[PDB]
Structure 1
Amino acid sequence: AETLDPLRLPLQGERLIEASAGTGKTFTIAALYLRLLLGLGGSAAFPRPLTVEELLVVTFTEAATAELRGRIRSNIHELRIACLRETTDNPLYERLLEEIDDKAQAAQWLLLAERQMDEAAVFTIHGFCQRMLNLNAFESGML
């Protein structure tokens, strides 16, 4: 196995993260969510930045999904404030601000993510299955 850095993880193919007990799993998930939103990483980055309605997060417990949605919303607001101010008090937010070259487009994308946070695609397993059965009902054959 290898060590995991949230700002150097290649988001290509299949990756297996083993988060031990007590580790910051919800923080690493929020960091990877901001990385997928802003499109950071350089050579190991995504080929294109994605919106809020294109990032799928699957967690079993509904309260865990609500807590993760609230934490990602708070992280989006804090990163938008730190990008408007060009300064922060967090070292991971400092490296996130150091990774980007442009500030106005990133701030506009974070504002659009804050406004589209209600339509975020962070659902459970059975909720995602019901949504995919009700959406494409023709190929599946669902009422």
Structure 2
Amino acid sequence: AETLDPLRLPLQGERLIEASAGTGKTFTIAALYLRLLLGLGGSAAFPRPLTVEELLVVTFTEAATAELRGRIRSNIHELRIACLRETTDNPLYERLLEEIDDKAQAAQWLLLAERQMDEAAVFTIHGFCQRMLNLNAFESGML
């Protein structure tokens, strides 16, 4: 087992992150989400930047989906604000901004994401399969 840096994690193939309670497991999901939106981490980064509607997050409770949806909304907002101010008072955003190359284009993608946040993909499983079937029906052999 290796210790984790949110910004060092390669996002390729399957990856398991394990840690005890209160360790900020939920808290990290935000950071990886942003990272995914911007395509950051370099070597550890995903091949190409992704669109809010292409990111799947699956959580345990309907309430948790609401909360996490909100937190991701806020964090995208704040990070955008920072990208326009080029400085920030929070350490994680500060490291992200050190990694980011062009801050302007970054702010543009962020804005677009922020708009897309309505249809942003967050579900539970029982809320996921629900959608997915009704999405692609033939394959699934559904009405």
Instruction: Give the TM interval when normalised to the shorter protein.
Output: over 0.9
Give me the whole-angstrom Cα distance separating, in 1, the residues matched to 2:19 and 2:131.
Answer: 29
- Name the structure 1 match of 2:32: 32
Query: The residue matched to 1:8 in structure 2 has which SS?
Result: coil
Shift of 1:66: 0.7
Instruction: State how far apart, in whole Å, the 1-side matches of 2:96 and 2:122 are.
Output: 23
CA deviation profile, 1:33-90 (whole Å, cap 9, x unmatched): 0000011101111110000000000012011111100000000000000000001111
Helix, strand or coil at the partner of 1:15: strand
**How many angstroms does 1:26 deviate by?**
2.1
CA distance in 2, matches of 1:26, 1:75: 13
Q: 111-120 or 133-142: which moved more? A: 133-142
5+ long unaligned stretches in structure 2? none
Deviation of 1:137 (Å)? 1.2
Residue 93 of structure 1 corresponds to: 93
Counterparts of 1:38 and 1:140 in 2: how far apart (Å)?
Answer: 33
Runs of 4 or more off by more than 3 Å in structure 1?
Answer: none
Report how many aligned residue pairs link the two structures.
143
Percent identity at matched positions? 100
Structure 1: runs of 5 or more not aligned:
none
Shift of 1:131: 1.0
- Aligned residue in 2 for 1:79: 79
User: Per residue, is there more strand in 1 or in 2?
Assistant: 2
**3-state SS, counterpart of residue 16 of structure 1:** strand
With the length of structure 2 as denominator, give the TM-score of the two structures: 0.97
What SS does the aligned partner of 1:14 have? strand
Deviation at 1:109, TM superposition (A): 0.3
Provide TM-score, normalisation by structure 1: 0.97
